[PDB]
Amino acid sequence: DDEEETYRLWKIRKTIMQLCHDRGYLVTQDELDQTLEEFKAQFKPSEGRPRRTDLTVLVAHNDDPTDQMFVFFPEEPKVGIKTIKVYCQRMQEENITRALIVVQQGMTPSAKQSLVDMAPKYILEQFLQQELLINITEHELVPEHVVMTKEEVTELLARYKLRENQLPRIQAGDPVARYFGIKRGQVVKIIRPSETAGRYITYRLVQ
Amino acid sequence: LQDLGVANGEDLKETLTNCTEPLKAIEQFQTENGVLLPSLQSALPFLDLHGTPRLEFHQSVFDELRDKLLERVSAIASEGKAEERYKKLEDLLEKSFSLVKMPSLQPVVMCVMKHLPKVPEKKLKLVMADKELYRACAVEVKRQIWQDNQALFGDEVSPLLKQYILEKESALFSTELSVLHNFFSPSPKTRRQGEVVQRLTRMVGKNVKLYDMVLQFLRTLFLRTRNVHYCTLRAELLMSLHDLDVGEICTVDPCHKFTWCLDACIRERFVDSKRARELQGFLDGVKKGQEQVLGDLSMILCDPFAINTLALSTVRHLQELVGQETLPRDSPDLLLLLRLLALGQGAWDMIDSQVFKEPKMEVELITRFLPMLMSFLVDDYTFNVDQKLPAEEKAPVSYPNTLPESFTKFLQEQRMACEVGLYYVLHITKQRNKNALLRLLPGLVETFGDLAFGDIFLHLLTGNLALLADEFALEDFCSSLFDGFFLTASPRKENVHRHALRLLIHLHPRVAPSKLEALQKALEPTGQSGEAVKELYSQLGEKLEQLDHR
Amino acid sequence: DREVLRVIFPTGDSKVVLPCNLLRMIWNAQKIFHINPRLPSDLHPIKVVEGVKELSKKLVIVNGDDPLSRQAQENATLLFNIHLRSTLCSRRMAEEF
Amino acid sequence: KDILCRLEHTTLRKVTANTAIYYDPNPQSTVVAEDQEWVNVYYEMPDFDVARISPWLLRVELDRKHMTDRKLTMEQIAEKINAGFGDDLNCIFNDD
Amino acid sequence: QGIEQISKVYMHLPQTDNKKKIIITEDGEFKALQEWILETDGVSLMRVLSEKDVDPVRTTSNDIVEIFTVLGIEAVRKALERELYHVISFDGSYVN
C-alpha cells in the first residue's frame, strides 16, 4: 500500500543515512533528522514517484573526499545480473569503488556469485530491505562498535604482546560487521558498560 | 520644550538673569517643571533628606513609564478600533516628534511610523536627512520613504551592490586548490545567509514597489556589466523573500515557483526528471501575450551555480547516453537542459531587447557534436577494458587522442557547444582521464566570446589541477593550459592573467624550476590589469625567490 | 561521575559489588582514633581532595603510561573511583564523618 | 490491543464459522434464499460473469465475534484473497 | 493479519519495577512509569522490530540464536548473560 510504502522507504532512508554517518561518510544533520513529512515534501508513491533510482544517493568521506559511496535501490523483486552491470558501469562512470545495494525481498544466487567475484576491484554489499527497516546499532544490547585504523591495531598488539589470531573473533557476516562494512582483517574496538568496572573495552578481529 | 508650551534652559537663565531675588525665581522654575502630583510636593523635601535627589526617582519612573509608552504604541497599533487607534497614534506622533531631537522619543515615534502604512512625508524626509534618524529608524519608516521616493533606496543599494561584487570578485580569485572543497560548494541558500541580501530583503520587506526597484537596479547594472552577479543577487533576493515566506512576492511572481525549482536543481547540481518536468511545464506555459517575464525568467538562470548545474547536467546526459546505446536525438531531458541554458545565456540579450521565442537547436550541434563526444567516451572505455583484460595484445589499443576538427569547430563557433565542452573537460579532469584531457584541451586556442576564459570555468579548472600536481613538474601539462591556452587570452582580460598567477602561486612548490621561472617572466603584468595583477606578481616574485631555494 | 553512573545504571539500582567497604573502613577509622563527631574537625577539605587524587593514582589494575594503558586503567577502576570520590568527598568527610 | 492484533498471526480459519461448497450453476440464482438478495446487489453490474463463471460455489461464514475482536472488516479479507490468488478466484462478499 | 510464528500475545502492565519504564525526570530523580508490554509465544524478531509504533530499542527476545542472527555477537553475548542471570536469580539465589 502507498502509505506504508512511503513510511517504509522514509525509514530505510533514515537507516542508511545513519549508517553512512557511522561509516565516516559526510551527511548533513537535516537528512539525519529528516521527518516523514519532509520525505513526503522532498519527493504519494503508488507509481506516482517510487522511482527507486531517484532514492539512490551518493556520499563522500569526511577525511577522504575521493573515497565516495553510492547506495542503490533496485525496483525489481530479486536483483538480476544486468542491473548489477548497470550499477557497475555507473560506478565506472563516476569512479566509485564502494556501493552497497538494498534489495526488495531477495537477491538472485547468480548475483550472489556476480558480486563476490568482482569484489576485489569493486566493493559491493547486499542488504535485505527488512534489515534496514531498523538501525540495529540503537538497540540496548549492542554496545558501541568503532573500527580501528591499522596504526591503532599495531599499537594494540604491541601493548599486549599479542598476535591477531589471539584476539576474540567476529564473523564478517555479523549484522553489525555488515553495518560497518568491515572486511576480514579489520579490528573492532567494542566499548560496553560493565557492572564491575563501569566501562570495559574489548577488541574483536574480523574473521 | 517650547513646542508644546514649556520652558527651556535659556528661559531659566532669563528667569535668573537680572533678578533681585534669584533664589525664589529658581524655586518657581523648579515648581513649574516638577512632576504634578499633590503627594510629591511634600515628599520631595523628605526624600531629598535621604541623600537621594528628586531626579533619581524621576529616572526610575522615567525608565518605567517610557517602557509602558512603547508597549502602548505597539498596543494601539494592535489594539482599539481602527480609526480611533490610528487617530491616537497620529496625534501622539504630532506630540512626540518635537522630542525626536531629544534622546528619549526617537524610537517611540519610529515604532509609530512603523505601524502606520502612510505618513505625512515631512518626517520621513527628516529621517533620511538626519544620520541619527537614518540609523535608528524602524524598517517600515525606511520602507515608506523608499515606497514614496527611490533616492535613498538607490543611495543605500549602491554600496551594498558594490559590496556584493567585492565578495564575488574576491571569492572568484582566491588561491586554494584541494580534493576537499572549492568555492562553489555553498548552495544558493547557503549564500543567501550573508547579511547583504537578507538585509536587502528587510529593506524590501513585503513591498512590491521596492521589489521592482531592486529589479531595475540589478537590471541597469547587469546591462552595463554583462556580469552574472546581479542575476544571482536577484535570485538570492527572491528566494530570501521566500525564506521569510513573503506571500506578497512569492504568490504573484510567476518566476518564484521556477526559481524555487531551480534552487533544488542547483542544490543537486543537476536537473532530474521531477524538477525537469516542473521547469519544462513552466517553460511550456510561455504563450503569446504573457511572455513579458521571459527576460526576468532567463535572468534568473544566469547564476554561476546554475551555469555549473546545467553544464554538468549536459555532460552527465552525454555520458549516460553512452551506456544506454541511444542516439542523442532520443534525449528529451538533454534538449530541455540545452533549451534552458540557451535561454539563460540569451537572458542579457533579452534585457537589452525583449525577444520572446523558444530557440531552435543547431543541426550539427545535435547530429554531429554529441555522437562524437559519445564516441570519445566509447573509445576511452574500450581502452580501459582492453587494459584490464588479461593479455589483450602487445601495446594495447591506443585510445584516440585525436581531434576530429568538427569538435574544435564547435568548441570555437557554437556557444552552447563551447560551454558543454568546457564542462566536459572539467568532468574528465575530476575523473582524471588524462588522455581525454589532452584530446579535448587542444583546439581551445580559438573560443567563442572567451567563455573558456571566464572566471567560473577558469576557477574550476584551477580547482581540479591540484589532483595532477606532479604533472606540473612536466612542462607539457602546464604548457598545454598556460603556454597554449591561457596566453592565447591572458593579455586580453584581467581575470585570465589573475587566474594563471593564483594557480602558480598555490602550486609553486611542485612546478619545475625553469618552468615556473619562464611562467612568471612570461605571465608578468603585460599592461591590461591593475592592482590585482600587481599584488599577484609580487607574490609570484616572492614565491619564485622561495622556489630558488627549492 | 553522577551522569556516568546514570548512563551505566539506567534502572537506578545503587546496590553494586566493589572491593573495599568504604563505609565500614570510615567507621573503623572513627572508632580507632576515638573521633568525637560533636566537635569541629582539623582536616582540610583540600587535603581530602589531594589525598583521594593520589590514592586513585596509587590504585593500579593495568600499568603503563601510553594512552592505551591509561585508558584501560581509567575504565578498569572507573566505578570504584566514582564510589571513592563520592564517599570520601570533602563535604561528607567534614559533615558526617 | 490494536498493535497486538496487528502482529499476532491470524489466519482465515480463526474467523470462519463454517463453509459449504454448493453447486448453484446459474450464478444469478442462489441455492440459499438469503444469499440471492445481496448476490443480486452484486449482479446488476456484471463482474467477471459475462463469460461462463465456474458453476461451483464456495460460500463461507465469518464469525462476527472474532471479526470485531481482531478489528477485521469484510472487504480487506477479499483484498487479501485476491492478492494471494490474483483474479483466479472471483470473490464477492455480503454487505456488512 | 499478523506476523507468522506468533501464536499468542499477552498484553499486560508489569507491576514489578524491573520491566517498568524507568526514566530520570528533570529534577534528576528516578521514576518508574507503568506502561503496557506485550509478551508473545514464538519469535520473529526482525519482523516485530520492523513494525510501526514499536519500541525498537528495548524490544528483546529470550531466543539467543535469534539475537545472534539479527543483532550480532556482542548483542547475543549480553542477551545470554542477562538470560542466564535471570534463570539463576529467579529462585532468589545470587552468584558473582
DSSP for B417-477, written as a single string: HHHHHHHHHHHHHHTT-HHHHHHHSTTTTS-GGGGGGSHHHHHHHHHHTTTT-GGGTSHHH
Of A58, A84, A83, A85, the residue nearest A69 (C-alpha): A58
Cα B478 to Cα B472: distance, rounded to the nearest angstrom: 6
Q: Which residue has the cell 615556473?
A: B516
Query: CA-nearest residue of chain A to C64?
Result: A159
* Residue E80 touches chain D, beta carbons under 8 Å: no
Reading the block at residue B33, the C-alpha cell is 517643571
Pairwise CA distance, residues B307 & B343, whole Å: 11
D16 three-state secondary structure: strand
Query: Which of A75, A109, A134 is a domain's end point?
Result: A134
Tell whether A129 and A141 lie within a shared domain. Answer: no
Q: Which one of E4, E11, E38 has the shortest CB-CB distance to D9?
A: E4
Shortest Cα distance from D4 to chain E (angstroms)? 7
Q: A112 and A146 in one domain?
A: no
Is residue E4 less than 8 Å (CB to CB) from chain A? no
Distance from CA of A138 to the nearest CA of B (A): 30
Check if the beta carbon of residue C77 is closer than 8 Å to that of residue C55: no
- C7 contacts on A by Cβ (under 8 Å): 193
If we measure between CA atoms, which residue out of B279, B246, B265, B282 comes closest to residue B189?
B265
The domain tally of chain D equals: 1
Tell me which H or E stretch contains B195.
helix B195-204
Task: For residue B355, give the DSSP letter.
Answer: -
Counting Cα atoms < 13 Å in the Cβ hemisphere of B275 gives: 24
Determine, for residues C10 and E22 on separate chains, whether the beta-carbon distance falls below 8 Å.
yes
Question: Across the interface, do A89 and B274 touch by the CB < 8 Å criterion?
Answer: no
Check whether residue A139 and residue A63 sit in a common domain.
no
CB contact under 8 A, A141 and E56: no
Cβ contact, residue pair E5, D9, below 8 Å: yes
User: What count of CB pairs under 8 Å joins A to E?
Assistant: 59
Question: Would the CB atoms of A159 and C17 count as touching at under 8 Å?
Answer: no
- How far is Cα A24 from Cα A68, in angstroms, rounded to an integer? 10
Contact of A85 with A113, CB cutoff 8 Å: no
Here the CATH number for the domain that contains residue A23 is 3.40.1340.10
Under a CB-based contact definition with an 8 Å cutoff, are residues A75 and A50 in contact? yes
Q: Which residues of B350-371 are buried (b: 16+ CB within 10 A; e: fewer)?
A: bbeeeeeeeeeebeebbebbbb
C65 touches chain A (CB under 8 A): no
8 A C-beta contact, residue C19 and residue C80: yes
**Cβ-defined contact of D4 to E38 (cutoff 8 Å):** yes
Contact E82, A186 (CB under 8 A): no
Domain residues for A157? 135-207
Distance from CA of E27 to the nearest CA of A (A): 24
Question: Would you tell me the crossing angle of helices B494-506 and B455-464 to the nearest 10 degrees?
Answer: 20
> Residue B407 half-sphere exposure, CB side, CA atoms within 13 Å?
22
D–E CB contacts, 8 A cutoff, strictly below:
38
Q: Do E18 and C6 touch (CB under 8 A)?
A: no
3-state secondary structure of E1: coil
Q: How far apart are CA D68 and CA A186, in angstroms?
A: 55
Rounded to 10 degrees, what is the CA torsion of B76, B77, B81, B87?
80
Please tell me whether residues A118 and A151 are part of one structural domain. no
> What is the rounded CA–CA span in Å between residue A43 and residue A21?
22
All 3 cell numbers of residue B182?
A: 572549492
Residue C61 C-alpha, separation from nearest chain E C-alpha, in angstroms: 19
Beta bridge partner(s), residue A59: A69
Residues A97 and A71 in one domain: yes
User: Are the beta carbons of E50 and A130 separated by less than 8 Å?
Assistant: yes
DSSP code, position B403: -
Distance from CA of A198 to the nearest CA of C (A): 5
B245 backbone φψ class: left, alpha, beta (φ>0; ψ -120 to 50): left
Q: End-to-end alpha-carbon separation of chain E, Å?
A: 45
Our CA-based measurement puts residue B385 at a distance from the nearest CA of chain A, in whole angstroms, of 11
E24 part of contact set with chain A, CB < 8 Å: no
Domain boundary among A102, A134, A166: A134
Closest by CA position to B224, among listed B303, B293, B161:
B161
Sequence letter at residue B233: L
Residues A158 and A119 in one domain: no
Nearest neighbour of E74 by CB, restricted to A130, A138, A192? A192
Which amino acid would we find at residue C94?
A
CB pairs under 8 A between A and C: 35
- DSSP-based three-state secondary structure for B264: helix
Continuous H helices in A95-129:
109-117
Chain C closest CA to E1's CA: distance in Å?
A: 36
Q: Say whether A93 and B273 touch across the interface (CB within 8 A).
A: no
Query: Is A144's Cβ below 8 Å from some Cβ in C?
Result: no
Residue for grid cell 591561457:
B486
The residue whose grid cell reads 624550476 is B513
Does chain B touch chain C (at least 3 C-beta pairs within 8 Å)?
Answer: no
Test C6 with E24 for CB contact under 8 angstroms: yes
Distance between CA atoms of residues E45 and E53, nearest Å: 15
Q: Among candidates B220, B225, B190, B218, which has minimal Cα distance to B204?
A: B218
Q: Centre a 10 Å sphere on the Cβ of residue B315 and count the other Cβ atoms it contains.
A: 21
C12:E30 CB<8 A: yes
Contact at 8 Å (CB) between B283 and B293?
A: no
| Three-state secondary-structure class, residue E22 | strand
How close is the nearest chain A Cα to the Cα of C64, in Å? 9
CA torsion angle B29 B33 B38 B39 (round to 10)? -100
Q: Distance between CA A134 and CA E72 in Å, rounded? A: 14
Say whether both A128 and A157 belong to one domain: no
Cell numbers for B170, please give them: 574576491
**Residue A196: Cβ within 10 Å count:** 13
Helix (H) or strand (E) holding A68: strand A68-72
Interface check D5 vs E, CB under 8 A: yes
Residue B387 burial (CB count, 10 A) = 11
Determine, for residues E70 and A140 on separate chains, whether the beta-carbon distance falls below 8 Å: no
* Cβ of residue E71 closer than 8 Å to a chain D Cβ: no
- Distance separating alpha carbons of residues A46 and A6, to the nearest angstrom: 9
Q: Are E59 and A134 in contact (CB under 8 A)?
A: no
**What is d(CA A207, CA B98) in angstroms, rounded to the nearest whole number?**
86
Rounded to whole angstroms, the Cα distance separating D71 from D81 reads 17
Same domain, A147 and A126: no
Are A100 and A15 in the same domain?
yes
- Residues 19-48 of chain E with CB under 8 A from chain C are 22, 24, 30
Angle among Cα B14, B19, B24 to the nearest 5 degrees reads 95
Quote the cell numbers at residue B345: 545565456
Cα end-to-end distance, chain B, whole Å: 77
Within 8 A of C17 by CB-CB distance, chain A residues are 195-196
Considering the domain architecture, whether residues A67 and A156 belong to the same structural domain is answered as: no
Q: What's the Rg (C-alpha) of chain A?
A: 19
Sequence-ordered alpha helix ranges (H) in A46-184: 52-55, 81-94, 109-117, 150-159, 175-180
User: In sequence order, which residues have a C-beta less than 8 Å from that of residue D3 and are 6 or more positions away?
Assistant: E38, E51, E53, E54
Between chains, do E6 and D9 touch, taking CB under 8 Å as contact? yes
Measure CB to CB from residue C68 to each of A155, A193, A198 and give the nearest one: A155
- By Cβ distance, the residue of A138, A170, A177 closest to E56 is A138
Instruction: Copy the grid coordinates of residue A164.
Output: 591477531
Query: What domain range is D83 assigned to?
Result: 2-96
Clarify whether residues A140 and A124 are in a common domain.
no
The CA-based angle B234-B237-B238, given to 5 degrees, is: 85
Chains touching chain D at 3 or more Cβ pairs under 8 angstroms?
A: E
Cβ proximity of B276 and B261 under 8 Å: no
Measure the CA–CA gap between A159 and A178, rounded to whole angstroms.
Answer: 28
Q: Taking a contact as any Cβ pair under 8 Å apart, which residues of chain B between 498 and 527 contact chain A?
A: none
Cβ contact A134–E56 (<8 Å): yes
Substitution target in E22, E71, E76 with the highest count of A β-carbons within 10 Å is E71
Regarding chains D and B, contact by 3 or more CB pairs under 8 A is answered as no
* Cβ of residue A156 closer than 8 Å to a chain C Cβ: yes
Query: Rounded distance, CA B506 to CA B184, Å?
Result: 18
Residues from chain A that touch C72, judged by Cβ atoms under 8 A, are 201
Contact with chain A for residue C16, Cβ under 8 A: yes
Q: Maximum Cα–Cα distance for chain B, whole Å?
A: 125
Residue ranges with strand state E in chain E: 8-12, 21-24, 30-33, 37-41
Check if the beta carbon of residue B369 is closer than 8 Å to that of residue B338: no
Contacts of D46 (CB under 8 A, 6+ apart): none
One-letter amino acid at D13 equals: R
Chain C interface includes E16 (CB < 8 A)? no
CA distance A47 to chain E (A): 23
SS3 (DSSP) at B97? helix
Using CB atoms, which chains have 3+ pairs under 8 A with A?
Answer: B, C, E
Residue from A98, A122, A93 nearest A19 by CA: A98
* CATH number of the domain that residue A143 is part of: 3.90.940.20
Q: Which three cell numbers stand for residue C12?
A: 537506578
CATH of the domain at D36: 3.30.1360.140
Same domain flag for A12 and A86: yes
Q: What is the experimental method?
A: cryo-EM
Tell me which of A134, A153, A184 is where a domain ends.
A134
Instruction: Specify the number of domains making up chain A.
Output: 2
| A189 and chain E in contact, CB less than 8 A | no
The Cα–Cα gap between A79 and A84 comes to 8
Long-range contact pairs involving B401-406 (C-beta distance under 8 Å, separation at least 24): B401/B435, B401/B436, B401/B438, B401/B439, B402/B439, B403/B439, B403/B442, B403/B443, B404/B372, B405/B443, B406/B364, B406/B368, B406/B369, B406/B372
Cell numbers at E75, concatenated? 548483542
Beta carbons of C7 and A193 less than 8 Å apart: yes
Q: Which residue bears the cell 574480523?
A: A206
Q: How many CB pairs under 8 A join C and E?
A: 8
DSSP 8-state code for residue A136 = G
Read off the C-alpha cell for B431: 575523473
User: How close B170 comes to chain A (CA, Å)?
Assistant: 25
Instruction: Write out residues 53-72 of D within 8 Å (CB-CB) of E.
Output: 70, 72
